[model samples]
Target: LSDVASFATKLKNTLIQYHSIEEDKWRVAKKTKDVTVWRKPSEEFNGYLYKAQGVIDDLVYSIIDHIRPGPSRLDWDSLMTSLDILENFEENCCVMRYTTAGQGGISPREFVDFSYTVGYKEGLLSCGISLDWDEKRPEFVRGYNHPCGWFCVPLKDNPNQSLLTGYIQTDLRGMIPQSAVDTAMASTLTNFYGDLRKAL
Candidate 1:
């Protein structure tokens, strides 16, 4: 009960995001395999945000069960190598992960691990998940510098299918690459949805 106050504070998890701007409307940047990828630049922070949306042939809760929990992400999330619970705020989790970063032709020679706090808000027709770096945790992942977060939403359109909405924001070093950023991130979400479809 002592930590409940902290929990309430962290509940302000950037679950969706802190803010948005009217100037940066999301646009479809890529499409493939029945999934489309959309992206828009950040007006509040120094990074970009993206969304990948498509229909999944599964119940909304089934999809939620797969994604709303931690450690369990290793099964369906291709990007995670290992996950640990650094702290827990009820359904909110601050996790430590040893995961991959950019592959500069060859992958970086760093064992990147960082703390990202994932929080969930259930309200489908629009169930969603939010993430932000656990700023309170020590930085060990990569030991360099990293800022990243993700958002997910699943909307039930029918009994047989749901619309999966994806959001990701990753900032490395400082500057974002030119064409490389678009290509890499576009493919990232497209492939994620592509692989995800098989599971539904």
Candidate 2:
């Protein structure tokens, strides 16, 4: 996912901050105490740090493996499939809603329903894939006039394309004020499709 890059960057910064704090604490303790006071790594702290390191390592590999300009051994279809799977998992697990939109903001359940309905319809039109719908399922409606509106249309029609578009919209929406959707979309497309083309 295009978000992976930004997420990794933020993660790295966070880790650096944590490490700095730890070092700072150690320094303070050493200066004040008689013996060389050090932070004894607790099991919880050790586990968290290890996990963080693993994430950092994966991020590094992802950059080198996918972002670099060279012949890639990556299977684009399979990668896309993995992306879709991850998208579904995230959409299902994360209960997102418009916090500012009063009481009846769009819930995760509704979002999932809307996304699938539109996705299937578009998939059928473009790729001859028939999408099934069950009225018994939950649904999400549009909230405030946000950038998510831009994606709501395409996502209902073409999930793959919509996903790429929606992610950029949702992340940058309301946050950047000026560059919002366009900037995010540009960065995401360039990284995702550009690398995809290179791989092909």
Local accuracy of candidate 1 as per-residue lDDT tens digits, 59-118: 666565555445445566675445555455444443343444444332422222333333
Write candidate 2's Cα lDDT for 1-200 as tens digits.
34534433443344234334444343211211111222222222211111011011121223333322112423431222111111231321211221111122223221111111112222211000111233332233322211111111123333332221111112212223322333333333343444443443
Question: What root-mean-square deviation over C-alphas does model 2 reach?
Answer: 20.8
Any runs in candidate 2 off by more than 4 Å, and if so which?
1-171
TM-score of each: 0.64, 0.21
The global C-alpha lDDT for each of the candidates, from Candidate 1 onward, is 0.50, 0.24
Clashes of 1: 3
